């Protein structure tokens, strides 16, 4: 059908995302208008597609960006303007960006092809029904009452709602049902401005309703059909697991973090300083935890990570924490009572309290009982090694002061 | 790096390269043996 | 089930002792406070048998009957057959 | 709403603590855990006043951790939905009012004000008041806030308050 | 531990209180030999046992 | 046998042939053809005095 979303099999446009034009049947071939892949570095050099193609083998595609004729321009290429779409090689391109494109049905993919929301934000009825749900009966015969959702279905839900002192259930179709919620209750969003958000309702306008966030001390108004009932808490669980909750980040190589909260776009990373500086999740790189690092603290006791300490000192006072993450003079501490920083704060090393190379060579054992066998170490201790003997099928401990190196 | 093997046939040495094919030079053969070691080696004779 | 009348048997159990044994055994080694003179001795095992000679095992068996209910001994209380 | 309950909690006792003031170590411990506990089922939990007993210690096999299961009397402060209650404004700015009540903090938005109060940036303590100026809700007062919300936060509940209702505000 | 894996009356690992395992077959650093009370260790066999 | 695999610390996983745990002799000797298809094959005899 025309603007619809559709894949590519084969070719160098392969797994881009693609929107209907015209389908021509009798021809076997439909129009996609998708992201142009261009290479600049080709047109600098003036090389031919014929040439490109033959030498295709080693050579890497060019990435999707927006058409540019001004870059062609400067680049020395020829651009050819006709009517509202512009002819270059061959091909017509859209003053927007989009390239236009005819190709063969059978490459074409019509089945299981679904777009990204990062796909359609750069090309650029439905309903939301769940079990334990509370919805009105906007219009009917029966209006103004208040049912649960027991059922859910497509285009008609046919829910078998609960009224008040109604212990029978009704039928309702999807248009017929609403999505309602009483005053002084909790409230998520799937999908809005601000989605995977949960708050409370201070009203319940006709169409805005009005909730407060967790996050930040601001308004929210989302559609009601938008909004959804769930006493369960906001999970917000990150997407594509780039980080995870308590990591070490590097914002900068003098400063590192902790991840103490996760959230749509935002990320409030915990650096040694303590204090909270937002970032984004591409800025923001993952640093590896020093499982085994050491410190220094007042009692001048050797601390470990995950030792129980007492902040009886410091930027936080009669505080209690295991260790997660380990600085020079710094330390983060984690805990589950604490609402403040996601249970998770950093206080200072020193305010804490307490609360090879003969590997592989063979030797000769020149003293002991063992004296003339050889062998090859196997492992070799500061003080003693492991010397496997040739002869005897068998590994023995012998003191390194027993052992010379045979020398070729 | 010369990998001097012996063929099984003709018994005879020659060099063979990582990636190289294996057969004789000498006669064809695709059967191959290391040569025995340098490394020293020792036994106590019990 | 009034611990006035207690019908179980008034000995302990080859299954009680060696549970009581283990278990002491097992606090001694976690380091919960001796209960008898600990002369020359180091083994968790053999200290919670010294115990158990002594009749000073602070622990106390609740054996449940069939019928659900259940009878409490101290376990000193218990005649100490092996 | 301020409460006073007798709660059950079962603690385990290292078996290092065996000593002769074991029942003290195990109403010490009960203390420092439940005291000050934020609940979803008996909302915060304010103090605890005595230990009803002490359960028989059970031995769990293969650890020698004792778990003791403990009932005592203990204050608590669970709000609701839709109550009247006092509360101290801890800071005023233009987004809307902050206030305490015991553990809980509580907050007032531009709908649960009247119509008749009004943001004053221009004043230097952010207030609300009407043309008339009758009423001035300052940071520290007493005001009377119908809770409307809560929500559970990191086993903390946090509400939110309102005061549309007639004369809920400073007295 | 000071024994090791190596020396056959020894030991194999030190479990501390964390319940982290301390692998004495690859030499770690003296450092994490340390014990303390809480910790365990992986002793080898040794005559006695049941 | 070191022997490694192109992969799609880098580029190559490791896929060599150990001696079998708790063994221990001499290689007796080396044998290198190619099977049916061409691919190099080792054949490796290994003797223990018992
Ligand atoms: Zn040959």
Same mark, same amino acid.
């Given at each position: 059908?025309?603007?619809?979303?559709?894949?590519?099999?084969?070719?160098?446009?392969?797994?881009?995302?693609?929107?209907?034009?015209?389908?021509?049947?009798?021809?076997?071939?439909?129009?996609?208008?998708?992201?142009?892949?261009?290479?600049?570095?080709?047109?600098?050099?003036?090389?031919?597609?014929?040439?490109?193609?033959?030498?295709?083998?080693?050579?890497?595609?060019?990435?999707?960006?927006?058409?540019?004729?001004?870059?062609?321009?400067?680049?020395?290429?020829?651009?050819?303007?006709?009517?509202?779409?512009?002819?270059?090689?061959?091909?017509?391109?859209?003053?927007?960006?989009?390239?236009?494109?005819?190709?063969?049905?059978?490459?074409?993919?019509?089945?299981?092809?679904?777009?990204?929301?990062?796909?359609?934000?750069?090309?650029?009825?439905? /309903?939301?029904?769940?079990?334990?749900?509370?919805?009105?009966?906007?219009?009917?015969?029966?209006?103004?009452?208040?049912?649960?959702?027991?059922?859910?279905?497509?285009?008609?839900?046919?829910?078998?709602?609960?009224?008040?002192?109604?212990?029978?259930?009704?039928?309702?179709?999807?248009?017929?049902?609403?999505?309602?919620?009483?005053?002084?209750?909790?409230?998520?969003?799937?999908?809005?401005?601000?989605?995977?958000?949960?708050?409370?309702?201070?009203?319940?306008?006709?169409?805005?309703?009005?909730?407060?966030?967790?996050?930040?001390? /601001?308004?929210?108004?989302?559609?009601?059909?938008?909004?959804?009932?769930?006493?369960?808490?906001?999970?917000?669980?990150?997407?594509?697991?780039?980080?995870?909750?308590?990591?070490?980040?590097?914002?900068?190589?003098?400063?590192?973090?902790?991840?103490?909260?996760?959230?749509?776009?935002?990320?409030?990373?915990?650096?040694?300083?303590?204090?909270?500086?937002?970032?984004?999740?591409?800025?923001?790189?993952?640093?590896?935890?020093?499982?085994?690092?050491?410190?220094?603290?007042?009692?001048?006791?050797?601390?470990?990570?995950?030792?129980?300490?007492?902040?009886?000192?410091?930027?936080?006072?009669?505080?209690?924490?295991?260790?997660?993450?380990?600085?020079?003079?710094?330390?983060?501490?984690?805990?589950?009572?604490?609402?403040?920083?996601?249970?998770?704060?950093?206080?200072?090393?020193?305010?804490?309290?307490?609360?090879?190379?003969?590997?592989?060579?063979?030797?000769?054992?020149?003293?002991?009982?063992?004296?003339?066998?050889?062998?090859?170490?196997?492992?070799?201790?500061?003080?003693?090694?492991?010397?496997?003997?040739?002869?005897?099928?068998?590994?023995?401990?012998?003191?390194?002061?027993?052992?010379?190196?045979?020398?070729? | 790096?010369?990998?001097?093997?012996?063929?099984?046939?003709?018994?005879?040495?020659?060099?063979?390269?990582?990636?190289?094919?294996?057969?004789?030079?000498?006669?064809?053969?695709?059967?191959?043996?290391?040569?025995?070691?340098?490394?020293?080696?020792?036994?106590?004779?019990? | 089930?009034?611990?006035?009348?207690?019908?179980?048997?008034?000995?302990?159990?080859?299954?009680?002792?060696?549970?009581?044994?283990?278990?002491?055994?097992?606090?001694?080694?976690?380091?919960?406070?001796?209960?008898?003179?600990?002369?020359?001795?180091?083994?968790?095992?053999?200290?919670?048998?010294?115990?158990?000679?002594?009749?000073?095992?602070?622990?106390?068996?609740?054996?449940?009957?069939?019928?659900?209910?259940?009878?409490?001994?101290?376990?000193?209380?218990?005649?100490?057959?092996? | 709403?301020?409460?006073?309950?007798?709660?059950?909690?079962?603690?385990?006792?290292?078996?290092?603590?065996?000593?002769?003031?074991?029942?003290?170590?195990?109403?010490?411990?009960?203390?420092?855990?439940?005291?000050?506990?934020?609940?979803?089922?008996?909302?915060?939990?304010?103090?605890?006043?005595?230990?009803?007993?002490?359960?028989?210690?059970?031995?769990?096999?293969?650890?020698?951790?004792?778990?003791?299961?403990?009932?005592?009397?203990?204050?608590?402060?669970?709000?609701?939905?839709?109550?009247?209650?006092?509360?101290?404004?801890?800071?005023?700015?233009?987004?809307?009012?902050?206030?305490?009540?015991?553990?809980?903090?509580?907050?007032?938005?531009?709908?649960?004000?009247?119509?008749?109060?009004?943001?004053?940036?221009?004043?230097?303590?952010?207030?609300?008041?009407?043309?008339?100026?009758?009423?001035?809700?300052?940071?520290?007062?007493?005001?009377?806030?119908?809770?409307?919300?809560?929500?559970?936060?990191?086993?903390?509940?946090?509400?939110?308050?309102?005061?549309?209702?007639?004369?809920?505000?400073?007295? | 531990?000071?024994?090791?894996?190596?020396?056959?009356?020894?030991?194999?690992?030190?479990?501390?209180?964390?319940?982290?395992?301390?692998?004495?077959?690859?030499?770690?650093?003296?450092?994490?030999?340390?014990?303390?009370?809480?910790?365990?260790?992986?002793?080898?066999?040794?005559?006695?046992?049941? | 046998?070191?022997?490694?695999?192109?992969?799609?610390?880098?580029?190559?996983?490791?896929?060599?042939?150990?001696?079998?745990?708790?063994?221990?002799?001499?290689?007796?000797?080396?044998?290198?053809?190619?099977?049916?298809?061409?691919?190099?094959?080792?054949?490796?005899?290994?003797?223990?005095?018992?």
């Amino acid at each position: 059908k025309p603007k619809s979303w559709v894949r590519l099999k084969r070719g160098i446009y392969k797994d881009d995302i693609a929107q209907v034009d015209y389908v021509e049947p009798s021809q076997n071939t439909i129009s996609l208008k998708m992201i142009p892949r261009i290479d600049y570095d080709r047109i600098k050099a003036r090389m031919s597609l014929k040439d490109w193609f033959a030498k295709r083998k080693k050579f890497k595609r060019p990435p999707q960006r927006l058409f540019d004729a001004e870059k062609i321009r400067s680049l020395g290429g020829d651009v050819a303007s006709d009517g509202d779409f512009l002819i270059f090689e061959g091909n017509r391109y859209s003053r927007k960006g989009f390239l236009f494109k005819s190709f063969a049905m059978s490459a074409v993919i019509t089945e299981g092809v679904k777009p990204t929301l990062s796909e359609l934000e750069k090309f650029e009825r439905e /309903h939301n029904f769940q079990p334990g749900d509370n919805v009105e009966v906007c219009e009917g015969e029966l209006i103004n009452l208040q049912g649960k959702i027991l059922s859910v279905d497509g285009n008609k839900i046919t829910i078998m709602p609960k009224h008040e002192d109604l212990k029978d259930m009704l039928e309702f179709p999807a248009q017929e049902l609403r999505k309602y919620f009483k005053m002084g209750d909790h409230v998520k969003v799937i999908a809005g401005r601000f989605e995977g958000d949960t708050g409370l309702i201070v009203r319940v306008e006709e169409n805005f309703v009005i909730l407060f966030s967790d996050l930040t001390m /601001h308004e929210l108004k989302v559609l009601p059909r938008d909004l959804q009932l769930c006493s369960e808490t906001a999970s917000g669980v990150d997407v594509g697991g780039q980080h995870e909750w308590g990591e070490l980040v590097q914002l900068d190589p003098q400063t590192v973090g902790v991840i103490v909260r996760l959230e749509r776009e935002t990320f409030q990373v915990l650096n040694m300083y303590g204090k909270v500086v937002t970032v984004r999740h591409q800025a923001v790189t993952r640093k590896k935890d020093n499982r085994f690092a050491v410190a220094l603290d007042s009692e001048q006791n050797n601390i470990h990570v995950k030792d129980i300490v007492k902040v009886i000192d410091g930027p936080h006072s009669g505080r209690e924490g295991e260790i997660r993450h380990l600085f020079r003079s710094f330390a983060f501490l984690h805990c589950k009572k604490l609402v403040e920083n996601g249970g998770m704060f950093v206080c200072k090393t020193r305010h804490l309290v307490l609360a090879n190379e003969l590997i592989g060579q063979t030797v000769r054992i020149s003293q002991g009982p063992y004296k003339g066998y050889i062998g090859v170490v196997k492992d070799a201790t500061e003080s003693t090694a492991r010397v496997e003997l040739h002869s005897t099928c068998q590994t023995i401990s012998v003191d390194r002061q027993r052992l010379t190196t045979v020398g070729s | 790096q010369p990998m001097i093997y012996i063929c099984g046939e003709c018994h005879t040495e020659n060099e063979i390269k990582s990636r190289d094919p294996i057969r004789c030079r000498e006669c064809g053969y695709r059967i191959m043996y290391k040569k025995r070691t340098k490394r020293l080696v020792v036994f106590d004779a019990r | 089930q009034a611990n006035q009348k207690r019908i179980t048997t008034p000995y302990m159990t080859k299954y009680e002792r060696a549970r009581v044994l283990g278990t002491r055994a097992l606090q001694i080694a976690m380091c919960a406070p001796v209960m008898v003179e600990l002369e020359g001795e180091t083994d968790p095992l053999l200290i919670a048998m010294k115990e158990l000679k002594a009749r000073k095992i602070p622990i106390i068996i609740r054996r449940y009957l069939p019928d659900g209910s259940y009878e409490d001994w101290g376990v000193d209380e218990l005649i100490i057959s092996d | 709403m301020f409460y006073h309950i007798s709660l059950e909690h079962e603690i385990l006792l290292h078996p290092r603590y065996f000593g002769p003031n074991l029942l003290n170590t195990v109403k010490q411990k009960l203390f420092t855990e439940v005291e000050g506990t934020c609940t979803g089922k008996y909302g915060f939990v304010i103090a605890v006043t005595t230990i009803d007993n002490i359960g028989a210690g059970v031995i769990q096999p293969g650890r020698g951790f004792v778990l003791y299961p403990v009932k005592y009397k203990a204050i608590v402060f669970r709000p609701f939905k839709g109550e009247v209650v006092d509360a101290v404004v801890t800071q005023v700015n233009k987004v809307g009012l902050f206030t305490e009540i015991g553990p809980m903090s509580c907050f007032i938005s531009r709908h649960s004000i009247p119509s008749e109060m009004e943001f004053d940036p221009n004043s230097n303590p952010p207030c609300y008041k009407t043309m008339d100026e009758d009423i001035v809700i300052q940071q520290d007062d007493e005001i009377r806030l119908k809770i409307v919300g809560t929500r559970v936060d990191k086993n903390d509940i946090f509400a939110i308050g309102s005061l549309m209702d007639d004369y809920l505000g400073l007295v | 531990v000071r024994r090791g894996n190596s020396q056959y009356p020894g030991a194999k690992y030190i479990i501390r209180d964390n319940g982290d395992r301390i692998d004495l077959r690859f030499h770690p650093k003296p450092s994490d030999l340390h014990l303390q009370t809480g910790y365990k260790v992986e002793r080898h066999m040794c005559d006695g046992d049941i | 046998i070191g022997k490694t695999v192109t992969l799609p610390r880098y580029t190559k996983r490791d896929c060599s042939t150990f001696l079998r745990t708790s063994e221990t002799g001499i290689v007796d000797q080396v044998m290198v053809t190619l099977n049916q298809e061409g691919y190099k094959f080792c054949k490796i005899r290994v003797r223990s005095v018992r």
